[model samples]
Target: MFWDEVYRGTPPWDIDHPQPAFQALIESGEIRPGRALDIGCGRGENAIMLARNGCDVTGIDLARRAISDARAKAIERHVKVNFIVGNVLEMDQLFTEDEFDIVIDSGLFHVITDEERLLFTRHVHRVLREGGRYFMLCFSRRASRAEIESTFSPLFNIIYIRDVIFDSLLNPGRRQAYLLSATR
Candidate 1:
């Protein structure tokens, strides 16, 4: 599978630390201690950070190797985070409705096509509790503002959408990305 191939070696996106956007939120207290889910959590950096910040965290990725490494890292960090091998598009099968207080997507939405993106948004909406928050950092180069609005607006209330400079793991230079915060 594609994800398996990506994880065969160290994936470009596996930065071995929480993304700056997520770290900023955690440090700023924007992401309070609560039940948190990290979708496409490649190496569990974000999930581990969330757990350290007192959130009960769970991370899911399609690649088994990624999940395995994530589990090892969680253990090494002495933090409790549930890591599971799963697909984001099928999250509804893995989690109960209204189960999480916060959902995070870092780089996953930009990779999925429109159909799968809708499914991902729907599943995220279903699992997030009422008034829960969803934080997403995606590559704006692939998904435009209008596309993002059309995909997420029906299920979430757009709290903010802003452009941010992000250092890409796959490339040498920084690029423009979108940080989307929403409420469900």
Candidate 2:
């Protein structure tokens, strides 16, 4: 219900361009082109960006309108992306094990409950290839770096965890965000 309401209108996080953190990683060669999966991919800006960079991308979101808009945007941009309406906790239903080389979580982790977080993490691990990368950009206001690291470390090798400033049109001020990189 919350996600549907959020997607009913343009949410604050729905920027026209790719997330700056993700774009920077792509430019730096850290997130190379590969089979990429974008969890909670909203209107699919990040998925489109990945496809444009040569990664075969698939994006999933629980919001139907968001998926519809994402598909329209992909067509408008002439980029091929598979945008699906589904829950992140049920990713295995949509994809096979080791199907993705890179998995991205942009603003998804911070929104879900703790129980859902665990389930989401498990699904990510199941779908990612061996030694594949999982890049997450989440709000730090709700959870600390230690908590995130502790939650994910068991399933992934912690590569790096750092804080970033997130600018949003919906929010009046900048908020603290976290960028986490890990390998499974």
Candidate 3:
């Protein structure tokens, strides 16, 4: 209900373009061409960007409207991306285990509750192959860094969590955030 309403109007996270952090990763050669999955992709910007970079990308979101917009944007951008409307925690129904090499989450980790976080981590960990990388950017507010680490530690190895920033135009400018990168 909440997410669907947000998509019906405008979500704070959707910037009409790829998130800058992902852009930086693309430029730095970190996001190479591979089978990529973007969880909670709002409007498919990051997923389209990934596909444009030569990665076979798929974007999944809970809101059907958001996924529809994402698909339209991908088509308009001339990028072939598979966009689906589905729950992140139940992603197994849509994807097989160890099916992707890269999974990107721009702003999903911060909003999910503890239980959803556990489920999301397990699902992401299951779908990613060994050596596959998961990149997540989350603001530092709701969950303590320790809890966040603990949530993902069982399935993914600890990686560097560095301070970063994000762009938000709907509500406000922005605030502090962190980028977590891990390998399966």
Candidate 4:
């Protein structure tokens, strides 16, 4: 389970706005409104934001409490979002393969064990369509050559990496959030 208990009720991770990187994509016209999925979508704030921005968003999270909160939030916002309460790694049978224009995962990969991380990557590749974008925000290894050579290099073709300072009100860290955009 997520170590944090706040997400059970009022999720600590629910930032009301689209992430800066995601917003930048919206602004730059790279990721337009389309069928999107947010894997391990904690409280669905980002999913809801995508729906409000005109995408058909589906959010999947393992936490029941968080899923309820996500649905409530979407209702309150008057936007539609499909929130599923289940482990993302095991939900492939529920969805068709090679769907979704965009797939986003934030913070879900970092806390996982090494084995699960590989599974996550494989599943991402399986679900993404050709030319579809997968956006992941993860804790950065600032200038860690080892991380560059190991953690990132073998899994994804690096597209963009930024040393973003956390806004503090939303994120809990000042470290960079690597924006890894990849395709299957």
What C-alpha lDDT values do all the predictions have? 0.87, 0.89, 0.85, 0.72
TM-score, prediction 3: 0.93
Give the per-residue Cα lDDT of candidate 4 at 73.
88
Residue 104 lDDT (model 1): 91
Cα RMSD (Å) between model 2 and the true structure?
1.6
By the lDDT metric, which is better: model 1 or model 3?
Answer: 1
User: Once model 3 is optimally superposed onto the true structure by TM-score, how far is the C-alpha of residue 72 displaced, in angstroms?
Assistant: 1.0
Instruction: Give lDDT: candidate 4, residue 68.
Output: 85
Tell me each candidate's RMSD, in Å, in order.
Answer: 1.7, 1.6, 1.7, 2.8
**Weakest 10 consecutive residues of candidate 4 by summed lDDT:** 165-174
Report the C-alpha lDDT of model 2 over 72-157, residue by residue, as the tens digit.
99999999999999998887689999999999999988788976778878998999999999999988744588898888999999
For candidate 1, the 10 contiguous residues with the lowest summed lDDT are: 165-174
Please tell me which predicted candidate would have the highest TM-score against the true structure: 2
TM-score of each: 0.93, 0.94, 0.93, 0.84
Better of 1 and 4 by lDDT: 1
Model 1 C-alpha lDDT per residue in residues 66-153, reported as the tens digit of each score: 9999999999989999999998878767999999999998888878876577777888899999999999898775548778787889
Error of model 1, residue 86, in angstroms: 1.2
lDDT of 4: 0.72
